Amino acid sequence: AMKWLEESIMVKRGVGAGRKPVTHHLTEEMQKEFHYTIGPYSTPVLTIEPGDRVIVDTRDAFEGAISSEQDIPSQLLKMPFLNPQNGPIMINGAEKGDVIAVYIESMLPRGVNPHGICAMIPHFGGLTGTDLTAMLNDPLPEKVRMIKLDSEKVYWSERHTLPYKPHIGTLSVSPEIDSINSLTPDNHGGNMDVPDIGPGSITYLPVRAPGGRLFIGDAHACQGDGEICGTAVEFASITTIKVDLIKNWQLSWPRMENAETIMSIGSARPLEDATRIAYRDLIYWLVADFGFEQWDAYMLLSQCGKVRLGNMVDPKYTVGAMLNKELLAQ
């Protein structure tokens, strides 16, 4: 957003820092086929230089299959085939041990008279039995909400008009040899559904495949902590990002940064392990780059640490452990 970028890790360590960036338009025609698995086997759709900008025309989580409140999700969708992905985008010079920095500049709704979509998919959500939390109870009612929206507000209903706080649900890089579905978050990023990953945020992803192989998709107009019903307000967007490369920075999990905080993003089940992963990664980050002594960092976070529950519905839950940048002062 403002001048905090000057002190960001991306600007201070990114190799593309002072470059006049080339802006690429990743349209649907360039993408050709959207992907439902994130790995090293997909044919690259674009190759960029670190520091370049990319304007992505993303598709909603249902790849436009739902367009009416009278639609029936169980008849139009097949789990886990949600979150069609743009990519893979190749970053010149990226190799295992590096980090892709993704700065989201803006996110606007795409199409004339744009609509977002929230849905209650049978056997999927936070307060229902699913195919993982296998119960014998009947699934919840099958609902769909077509919500009108603009760059300022989300028109949920007569009673509630929500602010437009867009963010990317699925942001990731390829694993070394595995190919993970677009519904799962892991140590490569993925379907994290962390509300903070929107305009004014920089997400750091660990490279494990040559070229990085950046994937993006599943834009949300807004989202609650946990994305409890299974979906947020899913919409097609024009997401503009700046991608840079940090050389030889060993990360085990995704990290992000914004004007006010730094955050370690862990993903797993049960939810406590996702939280352990995040907090422990944050502690290692504080010791490595911010001069903290390990036990002091641990005990300090027991007084100042902040937690963001991302999703609690996907194959793996996602949690972000934060620390306010004011507490990083030496």
Nearer to its own copies, 30 or 135 (CB): 135
Q: How far apart are CA 4 and CA 189, in angstroms?
A: 24
Tokens of 96: 């295992």
Give the range of 11-19, 91-99, 140-148, 242-250 binding its own copies by CB under 8 A: 140-148
Question: DSSP 3-state assignment of 224?
Answer: coil
Give the range of 19-27, 44-52, 58-66, 265-273 binding its own copies by CB under 8 A: 265-273
Give exposure, 63-98, as e/b (b: 16+ Cβ within 10 Å): bebbeeeebebeeebeebebbbbbbbbbbeebeeeb
Nearer to Na ion, 261 or 311 (CB): 311
Q: How far apart are CA 266 and CA 246, in angstroms?
A: 21
Nearer to Na ion, 8 or 85 (CB): 85
- Pattern of binders to its own copies over 210-249, x per CB under 8 A? ------------xxxxxxxxxxxx----------------
User: Is residue 95 within the footprint of its own copies (CB under 8 A)?
Assistant: no
Tokens of 206: 């660990």
What DSSP character marks residue 38? E
- Pattern of binders to its own copies over 267-286, x per CB under 8 A? -xxxxxx-xxx-xxx-x---
Q: Which does 13 bind (CB under 5 to 8 A by kind): Na ion, its own copies, none?
A: none
Closest approach of Cβ 169 to its own copies, in Å?
A: 12
List the one residue from 1, 30, 76, 135 that touches its own copies (CB under 8 A).
135
User: For binding to Na ion (CB under 5 A), which residues are involved?
Assistant: 61, 169, 191, 193, 218, 234
User: Is residue 256 within the footprint of its own copies (CB under 8 A)?
Assistant: no
Element (H, E) at 198: none
Q: How far apart are CA 192 and CA 169, in angstroms?
A: 6
Query: Amino acid identity, residue 264?
Result: S
User: Is residue 307 within the footprint of its own copies (CB under 8 A)?
Assistant: yes
